[PDB]
Structure formats: C-alpha cells, structure tokens
Design an enzyme around this catalytic site. Structure first.
Site, PDB file in Angstrom:
ATOM      1  N   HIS A 132       0.830  -1.215   0.000  1.00 12.25           N
ATOM      2  CA  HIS A 132       0.000   0.000   0.000  1.00 12.25           C
ATOM      3  C   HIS A 132       0.852   1.247   0.000  1.00 12.25           C
ATOM      4  O   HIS A 132       0.310   2.342  -0.227  1.00 12.25           O
ATOM      5  CB  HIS A 132      -0.941   0.093   1.221  1.00 12.25           C
ATOM      6  CG  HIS A 132      -1.966  -0.999   1.279  1.00 12.25           C
ATOM      7  ND1 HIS A 132      -2.903  -1.183   0.281  1.00 12.25           N
ATOM      8  CD2 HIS A 132      -2.207  -1.950   2.211  1.00 12.25           C
ATOM      9  CE1 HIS A 132      -3.664  -2.228   0.589  1.00 12.25           C
ATOM     10  NE2 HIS A 132      -3.267  -2.707   1.756  1.00 12.25           N
ATOM     11  N   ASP A 170      -2.146 -11.057  -1.909  1.00 12.71           N
ATOM     12  CA  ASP A 170      -2.779 -10.494  -0.737  1.00 12.71           C
ATOM     13  C   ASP A 170      -4.258 -10.192  -1.070  1.00 12.71           C
ATOM     14  O   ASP A 170      -4.594  -9.863  -2.236  1.00 12.71           O
ATOM     15  CB  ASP A 170      -2.018  -9.207  -0.361  1.00 12.71           C
ATOM     16  CG  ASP A 170      -2.490  -8.580   0.945  1.00 12.71           C
ATOM     17  OD1 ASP A 170      -3.635  -8.005   0.983  1.00 12.71           O
ATOM     18  OD2 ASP A 170      -1.718  -8.702   1.918  1.00 12.71           O
ATOM     19  N   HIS A 172      -6.000  -7.706  -0.386  1.00  8.13           N
ATOM     20  CA  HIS A 172      -6.174  -6.285  -0.707  1.00  8.13           C
ATOM     21  C   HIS A 172      -5.473  -5.873  -1.983  1.00  8.13           C
ATOM     22  O   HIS A 172      -4.476  -6.466  -2.365  1.00  8.13           O
ATOM     23  CB  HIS A 172      -5.633  -5.412   0.414  1.00  8.13           C
ATOM     24  CG  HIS A 172      -6.337  -5.631   1.712  1.00  8.13           C
ATOM     25  ND1 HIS A 172      -5.843  -6.466   2.705  1.00  8.13           N
ATOM     26  CD2 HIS A 172      -7.522  -5.155   2.165  1.00  8.13           C
ATOM     27  CE1 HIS A 172      -6.670  -6.442   3.733  1.00  8.13           C
ATOM     28  NE2 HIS A 172      -7.699  -5.663   3.432  1.00  8.13           N
ATOM     29  N   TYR A 303      -3.359 -12.339   8.833  1.00  7.54           N
ATOM     30  CA  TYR A 303      -3.588 -11.987  10.230  1.00  7.54           C
ATOM     31  C   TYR A 303      -3.969 -13.114  11.159  1.00  7.54           C
ATOM     32  O   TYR A 303      -3.919 -12.933  12.365  1.00  7.54           O
ATOM     33  CB  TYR A 303      -4.499 -10.751  10.340  1.00  7.54           C
ATOM     34  CG  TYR A 303      -3.980  -9.656   9.439  1.00  7.54           C
ATOM     35  CD1 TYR A 303      -2.831  -8.913   9.815  1.00  7.54           C
ATOM     36  CD2 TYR A 303      -4.535  -9.450   8.151  1.00  7.54           C
ATOM     37  CE1 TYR A 303      -2.305  -7.932   8.978  1.00  7.54           C
ATOM     38  CE2 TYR A 303      -4.015  -8.473   7.293  1.00  7.54           C
ATOM     39  CZ  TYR A 303      -2.915  -7.725   7.728  1.00  7.54           C
ATOM     40  OH  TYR A 303      -2.382  -6.818   6.900  1.00  7.54           O
TER      41      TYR A 303
HETATM   42  C1  LIG Z   1     -11.756  -5.703   5.964  1.00  2.09           C
HETATM   43  N1  LIG Z   1     -11.265  -4.404   6.498  1.00  2.09           N
HETATM   44  C2  LIG Z   1     -10.295  -3.691   5.798  1.00  2.09           C
HETATM   45  O1  LIG Z   1      -9.495  -4.259   5.067  1.00  2.09           O
HETATM   46  N2  LIG Z   1     -10.293  -2.323   5.999  1.00  2.09           N
HETATM   47  C3  LIG Z   1      -9.137  -1.595   6.525  1.00  2.09           C
HETATM   48  C4  LIG Z   1      -8.959  -2.017   7.949  1.00  2.09           C
HETATM   49  C5  LIG Z   1     -10.014  -2.501   8.695  1.00  2.09           C
HETATM   50  C6  LIG Z   1      -9.508  -2.835   9.982  1.00  2.09           C
HETATM   51  C7  LIG Z   1     -10.087  -3.375  11.143  1.00  2.09           C
HETATM   52  C8  LIG Z   1      -9.286  -3.605  12.251  1.00  2.09           C
HETATM   53  O2  LIG Z   1      -9.795  -4.122  13.426  1.00  2.09           O
HETATM   54  C9  LIG Z   1     -11.121  -4.663  13.429  1.00  2.09           C
HETATM   55  C10 LIG Z   1     -11.378  -5.297  14.776  1.00  2.09           C
HETATM   56  N3  LIG Z   1     -11.054  -6.747  14.928  1.00  2.09           N
HETATM   57  C11 LIG Z   1      -9.658  -7.073  14.585  1.00  2.09           C
HETATM   58  C12 LIG Z   1      -9.386  -8.539  14.820  1.00  2.09           C
HETATM   59  O3  LIG Z   1     -10.306  -9.380  14.127  1.00  2.09           O
HETATM   60  C13 LIG Z   1     -11.655  -9.063  14.458  1.00  2.09           C
HETATM   61  C14 LIG Z   1     -11.971  -7.614  14.173  1.00  2.09           C
HETATM   62  C15 LIG Z   1      -7.913  -3.287  12.224  1.00  2.09           C
HETATM   63  C16 LIG Z   1      -7.321  -2.762  11.104  1.00  2.09           C
HETATM   64  C17 LIG Z   1      -8.118  -2.542   9.977  1.00  2.09           C
HETATM   65  N4  LIG Z   1      -7.777  -2.024   8.695  1.00  2.09           N
HETATM   66  C18 LIG Z   1      -6.462  -1.574   8.235  1.00  2.09           C
HETATM   67  C19 LIG Z   1      -5.768  -2.522   7.273  1.00  2.09           C
HETATM   68  C20 LIG Z   1      -6.024  -3.885   7.317  1.00  2.09           C
HETATM   69  C21 LIG Z   1      -5.362  -4.761   6.475  1.00  2.09           C
HETATM   70  C22 LIG Z   1      -4.445  -4.302   5.531  1.00  2.09           C
HETATM   71  C23 LIG Z   1      -3.840  -5.317   4.596  1.00  2.09           C
HETATM   72  O4  LIG Z   1      -3.644  -6.486   4.918  1.00  2.09           O
HETATM   73  N5  LIG Z   1      -3.662  -4.938   3.340  1.00  2.09           N
HETATM   74  O5  LIG Z   1      -2.820  -5.651   2.503  1.00  2.09           O
HETATM   75  C24 LIG Z   1      -4.199  -2.930   5.473  1.00  2.09           C
HETATM   76  C25 LIG Z   1      -4.851  -2.054   6.335  1.00  2.09           C
HETATM   77  C26 LIG Z   1     -11.404  -2.558   8.121  1.00  2.09           C
HETATM   78  C27 LIG Z   1     -12.458  -1.921   9.062  1.00  2.09           C
HETATM   79  C28 LIG Z   1     -11.368  -1.774   6.836  1.00  2.09           C
HETATM   80  C29 LIG Z   1     -11.822  -3.935   7.687  1.00  2.09           C
HETATM   81  O6  LIG Z   1     -12.633  -4.572   8.333  1.00  2.09           O
HETATM   82  K   LIG Z   2      -3.783  -8.322  -4.136  1.00  2.00           K
HETATM   83 ZN   LIG Z   3      -3.925  -7.339   2.842  1.00  2.23          ZN
END
Ligand SMILES: CN1C(=O)N2Cc3c(c4cc(OCCN5CCOCC5)ccc4n3Cc3ccc(C(=O)NO)cc3)[C@@](C)(C2)C1=O
Ligand SMILES: [K+]
Ligand SMILES: [Zn+2]
Ligand SMILES: [K+]
Length: 353
Positions: A132, A170, A172, A303
């Site tokens: 990213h 990935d 994303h 994760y």
């Molecule tokens: C799907 N999704 C998302 O990708 N959106 C970005 C985001 C989300 C999110 C939720 C988080 O905590 C939720 C609570 N609990 C955590 C344990 O599990 C149960 C829920 C924490 C960070 C977050 N981020 C940031 C992010 C995440 C992955 C990458 C990555 O891998 N890219 O390659 C990059 C940035 C969101 C809301 C939105 C979201 O839900």
């Molecule tokens: K990808």
């Molecule tokens: Zn990702």
C-alpha cells in the site's frame, strides 16, 4: 537451492497503544517457527537481512517521504501518534523505520541471491508489509513499497528494462505497486483482490478491472477484482488458469516477485476468504514455471497466525521442489469477474483471444 530470509529485529515494530492490533510482531516469528517445525528451515540457504539504504528507497520514494518516516525514529509517543494519524491505517513506533529498512534490504539480498545464481528461488518472512506504500506516502501498515523497491533494485543490477512480474495475491489491492508502475511496461503488475464494487479497503475504483495501465504501460496492469462475498481455491485456481498464467507466459518475466499476503486465507478475520494452504501451494507451483524458476515470495498481510504459518510454509515446500498436495464450480460473481478481466485485457494479450 531455496533461500530464506528472516530476522527477529523486524518484530520490534509494534503498536504501543493496542498490543492486540492484527499486524503483530509474532506474525513473522510464528511463520519462522512453523518452517522449523516442518523441517523446511534446515533445507534452505539462509540469506542475511540488511538495511535498505536511503538511496535504494529513492528508487521508488520521494526524499520528503523517506525523511518524514526516518524522523519518526526520535519521536515521543504523542508525536508518533500524530504522524501515524496523517496516514490511512498506520501505527508507528521508534523501531518502525528500522524494521521497514530491514524488510526492504532482506528482499534485496534475496533478489541478489537469485540473480547471482546462489539460489534458484527464495522466501522473505518480513514485516512491516509494503504494497500500500506509495511514492509520497505511507498507507495500510506499509511504509515503503518493499516489492516495488525490489523490482527496481533487481533492474539496477541487471538491466534497467529487466522484465519483472509482480503477482499480488494479498486479499487487498496493492494500490502503491499499481501506481508506482502504472506507466511502466517493464514491470507487469497482476493483483487478485477483494473489491466489492469499492466497499472493500482501500475503497478506490483504482482497483477495478478496467484499470489496465497508462501510456507505454497500457496492458501491463492486471486487476482481478472479486465481488459478492467469500472466494476460495476454485476461484483462485480459475483466475490463475484463465488470466495470471497465460498473461505471465506471454510477458516472459525474467524475475517473479510475489506480494504474498496470506489474508485471503481460510480463518483470516479481515479477508473473509477461504484460500487453503494447499491452494497457495498450487499457486506457488504454477508461478515456478516462469522465469526459469526465479521466484521471490515476499510476505505482505495475513492476520490469522496459524493460517499464515501453514500457508507460507506450504509455499516454501513448493519452492524446495516437494510435490503439490492433493486438491467445485465457481461462484457466479467470480465467473463474471474473470470474464470482465478477459474482455479488458484481450486487446493487449493474444493468449486471451
Ligand atoms: C476488511 N477491512 C479492511 O481491510 N479495511 C481496513 C482495515 C479494517 C480494519 C479493522 C481492524 O480491526 C477490526 C477489529 N477486529 C480485529 C481482529 O479481528 C476481528 C476484528 C484493524 C485494522 C483494519 N484495517 C487496516 C488494514 C487492514 C489490512 C491491511 C492489509 O492487509 N492490506 O494488505 C491494510 C490495512 C477494516 C475496518 C477496513 C476492515 O474490516
Ligand atoms: K492483491
Ligand atoms: Zn492485505
Ligand atoms: K505496470
């Protein structure tokens, strides 16, 4: 010979406000311990980590961005919080810049080991991730674009127009990688990612299938966007069969980098997909048929600690030459996605006609 790079010092990057934040120090130590358990580690040639230099970072990043991230090294918690908050989804600690340098430098040493012929292929168990990160900005757990940097690093020691394929599996979209190479015909970027018509992070139409590259890079950016909920092995295998592998063969890469997030894995709480360790093994195995086997697998996201450990270890087992493990019809929306990509890329790739 398969190379492997891992350095415990990359665990030092941490979220001081939320020690349960999903981008955990133990993502890389768990993957490494699993390679030890499966006896994969002792079959690999160990490549040392090193710091990327600021000059190397300038291959893809502005001097202002490098400078801003570097200044974080000498910040108190309050300013770390303020700086991280200037980006989308970034936490910074005093160790973050160092760890980002190590993740990049590790991949450079791995790409060097492949291109000098010390190893055929390699795995980089690294964090923080990369895809990213943009020229000018940090984003989404990423500070510098490790895979993009590695492609430029590889070009800097061979030839400027060395043909590099980056497969980003990935869950994303790698917005930073796409953008860095958007006008470039030397770096073919192929991403598979959850899109949901823009409802899935990073929430930009830049991830759609009709974004095919710009200028001389037209045809060299291939977005495979998923819509309509969970996808798994059948959809991934079909996309590799119809799209990834025919385009890749036509491009004839001289080096393959995998932006290998494991957040499309079964069990990932953020990705919501069901790609199995055996699925990732089959994807790796297919990519090995390219570039005379010159494949570098670079950890991105992922994760669920058990899921990413089993999945990345399965990829390494494939790179080592182990036989692919044993493996339905596609969800309707997946067919629609594949067919949209095929229509968008047929003008550029004869293999899709
Ligand atoms: C799907 N999704 C998302 O990708 N959106 C970005 C985001 C989300 C999110 C939720 C988080 O905590 C939720 C609570 N609990 C955590 C344990 O599990 C149960 C829920 C924490 C960070 C977050 N981020 C940031 C992010 C995440 C992955 C990458 C990555 O891998 N890219 O390659 C990059 C940035 C969101 C809301 C939105 C979201 O839900
Ligand atoms: K990808
Ligand atoms: Zn990702
Ligand atoms: K490109």
């Amino acid at each position: 010979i398969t190379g492997l790079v891992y350095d415990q010092r990359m665990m030092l990057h941490h979220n001081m406000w939320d020690s349960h934040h999903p981008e955990l120090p133990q993502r890389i130590s768990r993957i490494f311990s699993r390679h030890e358990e499966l006896r994969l580690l002792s079959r690999c040639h160990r490549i040392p980590a090193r710091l990327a230099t600021e000059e190397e970072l300038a291959l893809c990043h502005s001097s202002k961005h490098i400078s801003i991230i570097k200044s974080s090294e000498h910040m108190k918690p309050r300013d770390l919080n303020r700086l991280g908050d200037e980006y989308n989804s970034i936490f910074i600690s005093n160790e973050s810049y160092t760890c980002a340098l190590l993740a990049a430098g590790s991949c450079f040493n791995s790409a060097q080991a492949i291109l000098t012929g010390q190893v055929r292929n390699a795995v980089a168990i690294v964090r923080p991730p990369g895809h990213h990160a943009e020229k000018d900005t940090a984003c989404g757990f990423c500070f510098f674009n490790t895979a993009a940097l590695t492609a430029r690093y590889a070009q800097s020691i061979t030839r400027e127009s060395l043909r590099v394929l980056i497969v980003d599996w990935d869950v994303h979209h790698g917005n930073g990688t796409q953008h860095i190479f958007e006008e470039d015909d030397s770096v073919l970027y192929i991403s598979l990612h959850r899109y949901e018509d823009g409802a899935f992070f990073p929430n930009s139409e830049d991830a759609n299938y009709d974004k095919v590259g710009l200028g001389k890079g037209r045809g060299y950016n291939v977005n495979i966007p998923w819509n309509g909920g969970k996808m798994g092995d059948p959809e991934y295998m079909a996309a590799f069969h119809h799209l990834v592998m025919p385009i890749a063969r036509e491009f004839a890469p001289e080096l393959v980098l995998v932006s290998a997030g494991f957040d499309a894995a079964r069990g990932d709480p953020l990705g919501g997909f069901q790609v199995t360790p055996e699925g990732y093994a089959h994807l790796t195995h297919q990519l090995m048929s390219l570039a005379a086997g010159r494949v570098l697998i670079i950890l991105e996201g992922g994760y669920n600690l058990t899921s990413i450990s089993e999945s990345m270890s399965m990829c390494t087992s494939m790179l080592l030459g182990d036989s692919p493990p044993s493996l339905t019809p596609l969800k309707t929306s997946a067919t629609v996605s594949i067919n949209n990509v095929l229509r968008a890329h047929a003008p550029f790739w004869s293999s899709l006609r």
